[PDB]
Amino acid sequence: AIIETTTPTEEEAKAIAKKLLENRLIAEAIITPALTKIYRENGEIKSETVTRVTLYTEEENVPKAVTYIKAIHPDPIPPIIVITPTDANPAYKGWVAFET
Amino acid sequence: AIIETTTPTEEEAKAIAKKLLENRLIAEAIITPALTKIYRENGEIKSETVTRVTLYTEEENVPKAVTYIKAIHPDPIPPIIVITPTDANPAYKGWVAFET
Amino acid sequence: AIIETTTPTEEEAKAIAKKLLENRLIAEAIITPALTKIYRENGEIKSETVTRVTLYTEEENVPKAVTYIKAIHPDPIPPIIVITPTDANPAYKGWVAFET
Amino acid sequence: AIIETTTPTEEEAKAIAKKLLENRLIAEAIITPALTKIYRENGEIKSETVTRVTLYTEEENVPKAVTYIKAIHPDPIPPIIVITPTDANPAYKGWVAFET
Amino acid sequence: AIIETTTPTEEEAKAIAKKLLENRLIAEAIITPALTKIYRENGEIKSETVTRVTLYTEEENVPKAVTYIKAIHPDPIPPIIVITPTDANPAYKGWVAFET
Amino acid sequence: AIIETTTPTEEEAKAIAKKLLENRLIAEAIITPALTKIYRENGEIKSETVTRVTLYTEEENVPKAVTYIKAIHPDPIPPIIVITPTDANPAYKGWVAFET
Amino acid sequence: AIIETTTPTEEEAKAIAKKLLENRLIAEAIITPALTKIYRENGEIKSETVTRVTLYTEEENVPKAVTYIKAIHPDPIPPIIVITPTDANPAYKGWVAFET
Amino acid sequence: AIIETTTPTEEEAKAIAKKLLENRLIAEAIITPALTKIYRENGEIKSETVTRVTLYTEEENVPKAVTYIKAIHPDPIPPIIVITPTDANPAYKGWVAFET
Amino acid sequence: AIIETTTPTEEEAKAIAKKLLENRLIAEAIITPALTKIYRENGEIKSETVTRVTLYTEEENVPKAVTYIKAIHPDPIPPIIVITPTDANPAYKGWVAFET
Amino acid sequence: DPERPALGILELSSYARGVKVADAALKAAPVKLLKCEPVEPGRALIMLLGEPEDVAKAMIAALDVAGLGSGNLIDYALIPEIHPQLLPFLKEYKKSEPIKDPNKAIIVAEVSTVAAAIEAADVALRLANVELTSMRLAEHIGGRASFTLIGDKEDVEKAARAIRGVAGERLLDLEIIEKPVEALIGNE
Amino acid sequence: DPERPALGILELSSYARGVKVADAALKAAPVKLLKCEPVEPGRALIMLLGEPEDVAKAMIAALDVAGLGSGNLIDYALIPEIHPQLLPFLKEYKKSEPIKDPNKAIIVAEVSTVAAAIEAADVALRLANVELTSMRLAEHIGGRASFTLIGDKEDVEKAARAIRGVAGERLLDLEIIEKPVEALIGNE
Amino acid sequence: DPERPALGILELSSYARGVKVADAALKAAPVKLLKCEPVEPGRALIMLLGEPEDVAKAMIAALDVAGLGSGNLIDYALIPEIHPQLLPFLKEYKKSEPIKDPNKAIIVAEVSTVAAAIEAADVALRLANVELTSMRLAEHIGGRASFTLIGDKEDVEKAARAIRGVAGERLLDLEIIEKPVEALIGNE
């Protein structure tokens, strides 16, 4: 399973990943900095900088991980999305289970 | 639902996003610049620079949004792909419906 | 179908893509450089630089492509993940089939 | 349930109704005098005066009431017809059951 | 089966019954004169005199009889209604079949 | 659909019909005066004069019409009965729907 | 049906049987005296004398008979067991029904 | 299968068992003497001495054995009851089949 | 559940019961001495003295208890039979479970 | 309201639809609202009181909104003149008085909707010489309702025939008890 | 009643049938009625108290009327001598006292009928060294009942075996909690 | 607790399993327990209050015990900062004040779980200009819950879109009433 979210700064993204690793809820994380977001505020269109985070874990850990992210995220309504892959290298699934 | 496509320049990507927001067909967009694409032309392998765009919307808006993108895209055969997530924060789904 | 993996350097990522194109197993590839990965080694948390690769192909080619990637990847346990889209522009599916 | 028949005179119609009330087989009766009947006798068309009688009762009393009417009717082949209503005022059904 | 309709005068009602008997489409008819009808014309409520006719026949003759009545009725949109009884004296059903 | 009831006088019967027409709940009504009713009161058999009313309407209006009749009827327990015809002239059904 | 239980003395066993016969809940009883029982009390194995009683009755009387035995038995937790035979002499079943 | 009955004396019980063994209808029998029976005769409760007999055989021999017992029993209405066990030592079932 | 067997002497019967109680496989036992057995040996009918034992336990303990009895019984082919009751006092079932 | 009002009853399967129905009824005519409460499980009950023709206008408007035919409406009724003995049991909660005679019998009835219960009791009081002692509507129950009447043995017999006629397929149980013990009165 | 009475229990699926059953029982013998109430959904519960043989005569008459075999009778039981700790919880509503020791464990049980709950608790108190702290019968619930006991760890283990034996297929859930937190006592 | 606490919610199908889950949660972190009550029919509801990361640690321990995947867990949620208008309705029972304006519209919603009801109301108060007037959870009901909001017509229209987004398939009914009559306020 893959979980995705965004934060305003690179520092905040690293802090979320470290907390999830210390609790043994995920196996690893990838961070993508310096993107642009476009949306509407007060009937006006504006743009700003954001950072993306991607997290890799096992299917049976998903409800626990989503609950913890909601508690520590800096935005008032955090976007959190879950994607289920159709296939994967079996040796890699073994490593993910070994790490969590 | 998530919709993905690519364009040759950063300027063209921003223009597509603004048009979709003014028609209230999407809620927000993320832009990723300065990537590399590799493919085959005339039996030869070449590489060039591209920009990626990701759009977030509701499931019932998908056929309208795809139709509009096809009409305004700069490439002769545009790649457009749709992905359906398996789960999401319920508060965020409320915000997306409120905005569209 | 979409296939994703990561490598330690940008040079290694380009080499994988070229080999798959010469064997006519994929239609095109996108490369994303200079990301950060966070994980645990020897009970310690560390971070390092990585590059991501995304590949686009037809559903009936997936088992052949995954097998070839496993044989030439530089890491001892390579992460390889497959995602199935729910919809796509029909003209683009025609181009993908024509190229492979 | 509603039961209908006809007789040659008004006096005969009243006599049938009184007998059925004394045996507690019906709840009430309505009598319509001075009608005209048209039919064929000996290959000739003729007309004559008749009286109609309508009787109101419960569904479980129908076989007993029809049997008694056949025994006391003045004509050699009496016409007797039963109609089942699709709905009725529930208070009136209570009164009909109380009376029989 | 029972068929019901209405006409403006008593003379017209008798004429309809005689035509149906000569063609052997019914077995007998009953005529009820001097009733009152109330309805709305030109946004106004009015009342007038009418006569009612009731006809008795077999179930397999119903489509033929209704068709003939429509052709000879004096009103521009004639009301014609069919009712199916739930039970009847078996000897009377024998007489009805013998006559038609 | 056909709805039937009875009242003690001719004047009361006309008043019920006019109220139902003004509210557009029925299309027309037929009134039959000077009949005889026979029933039992205080263990005794008695007879009296009555008037009958018949009303013609659409199936979807039946619950509303029955409710209104119950509210304005002069007797303490009014008899109200509903009959469903098996067939009718299609042009007449068009006129009934047009009027209500 | 067959019902079995045990008591400490022969006198108590006869008293139970007489009470059940006077209430017409059983047809007959058999008494087996001077047996030995072995069980554990306070982590120690002990033995004592007992008497067995067997009762014969009809299947529809079983819940009543078991309830009455529980009320009059001398032990604090009485053992009561029910066995259903697979076959029997039909004449004997007639006698049992005649007696109860 | 197990068959049970009772007799007034010990001598009569042994005679029944010997007859069944000579005809090869059972494999063995157990006899329990000097019991007490309680029942009602002429509206009075009385008690008397009895003996019990238990017989062991195969399921396919049951109808023959019950028929023979009825013919030779000394009481006018003999009690005969059949019980089917749920399990048994397989070696013992072999011995029973060998003997009959 | 009820388990039954027989032995040549009273002493041997008590020894079997004590062994089963020490291993906590049964809750209690009843012993019936001085019975007579009749059977055939070498084509001859003979009789001898026996003792009966009855044991009370829970359904889930039956396979273990039968196995242990087979190992310690003095006869070369021991008869062991299991009977399942159709009903019992619920308080007694509680005591049996508490003891094993 | 005069000495003798009329009563209308509506039963619905959704509390939100119930609020909408009650609003339309009160706008159509000057009637007074008695009950608009949710009913087990997730249902609603509406009772209206007023003049006979006013109640009729209100019920007509309610039947349009309620979707008569869409499965949201469970049952309904109109009673042109409610019996005097019934009114105290509806305005407030009542109890069972001491039963003066020991020679009277009682009858107990159980039905599946509130509309059936009120209409059946009203007709029985009108036609037979009996008295009403208790009425219990659905409260966390799930639609079941019941009531109890007392009178002489042959009068109670006549009332039973009337109750079966009114209730029809909505009747669940009916029992007659001759010479009941005292404690049944007190426990009631 | 003496110091030590007997108790009879009957559970039925119709309030009207329940009234009839209770009348027959009270006419047969001099017992005292505790409960005759309707039970969710549309059921009834009867409890009788008195001398052991008197209670037996009453239950015999009740079983004839109840139609044992027609599907109107859900469950029943007779208890010849009710345990002293159980009586306060049945006559009145009780509460949970402060738990003096912090080293005791607790056990919580859920069963499908009232008869199973009372009988199982009575046997456990008789055979094991435990104490009863709460008992909750069906009130708008739908038949489910539950109770709670406290004691030392190995004693609670023995009581669990007895409860499973009595309840049989009527047992729904059973849990043991070691060293429970304080708030669970207060919230109880 | 500070001015702004977090709230966690768990819904289970067995009262005994609920007691076990609550014990594990309270041992894992210093949170305060609000509700541990049985829920119709034979269910249980647990609410926890405290600091955001403390509530997260408690819910992690509870999800392990509850058997997430075995069918004992019905629904759950975590709300990082509960809206100020919602807190009074949860600590105590509240009522409907007189409605000052007659020009406002109202909206009524019905959902299938308690978790859906609290989360949907919180988001609507955050994004739209509306006010909360009533909230009713399941009490002998069977899981159904409902709430009511008031505001201007176009603002109520926006709130309806948000509610549909949050609830998803858990939404049962939703109605908008323009210019409601007075009695609906008083009966509320």
XYZ file of N, CA, C and O in Angstrom, chain K residues 106-156:
204
model
N -11.477 -9.386 36.976
C -12.914 -9.386 36.729
C -13.228 -10.212 35.490
O -12.380 -10.430 34.625
N -14.478 -10.661 35.409
C -14.985 -11.413 34.267
C -16.339 -10.838 33.861
O -17.150 -10.482 34.720
N -16.566 -10.710 32.553
C -17.789 -10.132 31.995
C -18.401 -11.125 31.014
O -17.704 -11.637 30.134
N -19.703 -11.378 31.147
C -20.400 -12.386 30.354
C -21.662 -11.816 29.716
O -22.349 -10.989 30.307
N -21.974 -12.292 28.509
C -23.163 -11.893 27.759
C -23.899 -13.132 27.258
O -23.289 -13.994 26.625
N -25.206 -13.212 27.518
C -26.019 -14.368 27.143
C -27.314 -13.900 26.482
O -27.683 -12.731 26.543
N -28.020 -14.847 25.871
C -29.156 -14.527 25.015
C -30.522 -14.567 25.704
O -31.480 -14.054 25.129
N -30.659 -15.150 26.899
C -31.939 -15.142 27.608
C -31.730 -14.852 29.089
O -30.652 -15.067 29.641
N -32.798 -14.374 29.730
C -32.760 -14.062 31.157
C -32.605 -15.330 31.992
O -31.927 -15.328 33.023
N -33.231 -16.429 31.566
C -33.121 -17.680 32.310
C -31.675 -18.162 32.381
O -31.214 -18.602 33.439
N -30.942 -18.070 31.271
C -29.542 -18.477 31.269
C -28.708 -17.616 32.213
O -27.843 -18.132 32.926
N -28.964 -16.310 32.244
C -28.160 -15.407 33.060
C -28.305 -15.704 34.550
O -27.304 -15.791 35.269
N -29.538 -15.862 35.034
C -29.747 -16.074 36.465
C -29.188 -17.425 36.903
O -28.531 -17.526 37.943
N -29.436 -18.479 36.123
C -28.960 -19.806 36.504
C -27.433 -19.884 36.502
O -26.839 -20.463 37.417
N -26.780 -19.301 35.494
C -25.323 -19.363 35.418
C -24.667 -18.633 36.584
O -23.701 -19.130 37.171
N -25.180 -17.455 36.938
C -24.611 -16.717 38.059
C -24.806 -17.460 39.378
O -23.904 -17.476 40.221
N -25.968 -18.089 39.568
C -26.233 -18.823 40.803
C -25.236 -19.963 41.005
O -24.718 -20.153 42.110
N -24.932 -20.711 39.944
C -24.026 -21.849 40.070
C -22.595 -21.384 40.325
O -21.874 -21.974 41.138
N -22.161 -20.320 39.647
C -20.803 -19.816 39.843
C -20.578 -19.328 41.271
O -19.516 -19.571 41.851
N -21.558 -18.638 41.854
C -21.422 -18.209 43.241
C -21.382 -19.393 44.197
O -20.758 -19.310 45.256
N -22.036 -20.497 43.837
C -22.082 -21.667 44.704
C -20.743 -22.401 44.742
O -20.326 -22.876 45.800
N -20.054 -22.504 43.608
C -18.893 -23.379 43.509
C -17.548 -22.675 43.647
O -16.572 -23.328 44.020
N -17.458 -21.380 43.359
C -16.185 -20.675 43.342
C -16.204 -19.498 44.309
O -17.260 -19.009 44.708
N -15.008 -19.045 44.682
C -14.837 -17.959 45.648
C -14.766 -16.624 44.909
O -13.697 -16.065 44.669
N -15.938 -16.101 44.546
C -16.060 -14.867 43.777
C -17.212 -14.045 44.341
O -17.960 -14.495 45.204
N -17.347 -12.822 43.838
C -18.362 -11.883 44.294
C -19.060 -11.238 43.105
O -18.441 -10.992 42.070
N -20.347 -10.941 43.270
C -21.180 -10.379 42.210
C -21.255 -8.862 42.336
O -21.546 -8.344 43.415
N -21.012 -8.151 41.232
C -21.003 -6.691 41.268
C -22.053 -6.017 40.395
O -22.449 -4.901 40.718
N -22.519 -6.640 39.316
C -23.570 -6.010 38.525
C -24.337 -7.056 37.728
O -23.781 -8.077 37.325
N -25.620 -6.776 37.497
C -26.498 -7.634 36.713
C -27.494 -6.766 35.960
O -28.210 -5.974 36.574
N -27.550 -6.917 34.639
C -28.359 -6.051 33.785
C -29.213 -6.889 32.844
O -28.685 -7.557 31.953
N -30.529 -6.827 33.016
C -31.450 -7.579 32.182
C -31.865 -6.756 30.965
O -31.446 -5.614 30.778
N -32.700 -7.344 30.119
C -33.099 -6.700 28.873
C -34.125 -5.607 29.149
O -35.208 -5.881 29.677
N -33.783 -4.369 28.802
C -34.700 -3.231 28.890
C -34.591 -2.467 27.576
O -33.609 -1.755 27.350
N -35.596 -2.623 26.715
C -35.585 -2.151 25.333
C -34.457 -2.771 24.520
O -34.200 -2.339 23.391
N -33.786 -3.786 25.062
C -32.586 -4.323 24.432
C -32.951 -5.318 23.339
O -32.578 -5.151 22.173
N -33.697 -6.358 23.698
C -34.072 -7.374 22.736
C -33.690 -8.777 23.151
O -33.540 -9.664 22.306
N -33.534 -8.994 24.453
C -33.252 -10.300 25.006
C -31.873 -10.460 25.608
O -31.691 -11.340 26.460
N -30.899 -9.647 25.202
C -29.542 -9.792 25.716
C -29.466 -9.421 27.191
O -30.135 -8.494 27.650
N -28.643 -10.153 27.938
C -28.416 -9.883 29.350
C -26.937 -10.071 29.658
O -26.217 -10.733 28.914
N -26.479 -9.472 30.757
C -25.067 -9.545 31.118
C -24.885 -9.394 32.625
O -25.756 -8.875 33.321
N -23.734 -9.859 33.123
C -23.374 -9.718 34.532
C -21.852 -9.747 34.681
O -21.129 -10.128 33.762
N -21.370 -9.332 35.859
C -19.945 -9.154 36.139
C -19.578 -9.692 37.522
O -20.283 -9.431 38.497
N -18.454 -10.416 37.611
C -17.947 -10.972 38.867
C -16.489 -10.570 39.089
O -15.753 -10.299 38.142
N -16.063 -10.577 40.356
C -14.707 -10.183 40.737
C -14.100 -11.196 41.706
O -14.791 -11.733 42.576
N -12.806 -11.453 41.553
C -12.090 -12.301 42.489
C -10.631 -12.432 42.108
O -10.147 -11.763 41.196
N -9.927 -13.306 42.824
C -8.541 -13.604 42.492
C -8.447 -14.362 41.172
O -9.402 -14.983 40.708
N -7.251 -14.323 40.586
C -7.077 -14.710 39.190
C -7.418 -16.179 38.952
O -8.121 -16.516 37.993
N -6.929 -17.072 39.810
C -7.190 -18.491 39.599
C -8.625 -18.871 39.948
O -9.171 -19.810 39.362
N -9.250 -18.154 40.881
C -10.653 -18.399 41.193
C -11.560 -17.973 40.043
O -12.530 -18.665 39.719
N -11.253 -16.839 39.413
C -12.014 -16.383 38.260
C -11.879 -17.373 37.113
O -12.824 -17.586 36.346
